[PDB]
Amino acid sequence: SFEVGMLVWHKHKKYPFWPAVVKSVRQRDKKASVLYIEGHMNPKMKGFTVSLKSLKHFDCKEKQTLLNQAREDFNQDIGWCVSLITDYRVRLGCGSFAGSFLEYYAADISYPVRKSIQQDVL
C-alpha cells in the first residue's frame, strides 16, 4: 500500500535507512520507484528502482530508531531532510500549500529552507 508521492524509508547496502518519496509504483508486481529526500536534490531526477518489501513507511513505529541511526554519521544531512519534510508538513497542515513534496521543493515557498541548507554548506 505504497501510493505515489508518499514518504518512505529505503536502505542501500552498507547504508542506513534514508527517507525518500515514491514516484512510480508497480502495485501488481511488488516493485516501486523512489527518490531520496536530501538537502540538495533534483526533484526531476527519475526514480531508481526498489521493491515494495524493502520500503518502510516514513511514519512507521521504527521512525525514531531509524532517525537516530542516521544521526550517527549524517547529523547535518538527516537534519536537512527533517527541515524540508517538516517545513512541507507545516505548509500542508496550516493550509498555506497543497501539492506534493517534490512540488514543495521546486516552489518558491521552500526558498527560506533551501536557503538555510544550501548556505549551511558554508
Author numbering: 409 to 530
Provide text from the study.
The canonical β-barrel core harbors an aromatic cage constructed by three aromatic residues, which is a signature feature of the Tudor domain “Royal family”. Taken together, similar to other members in the ‘Royal family’, PWWP domain also exhibits methyllysine histone binding ability.
In order to explore the functional roles of the PWWP domains, we determined the crystal structures of the PWWP domains from 7 different human proteins, namely, BRPF1 (bromodomain and PHD finger-containing protein 1), BRPF2, BRPF3, MUM1 (melanoma associated antigen (mutated) 1), DNMT3A, DNMT3B and HDGF2 (Hepatoma-derived growth factor 2). By fluorescence polarization assay, we found that the PWWP domains in BRPF1, BRPF2, HDGF2, MUM1 and the N-terminal PWWP domains of WHSC1 and WHSC1L1 show weak binding affinity to histones with H3K36, K3K79 or H4K20 methylation.
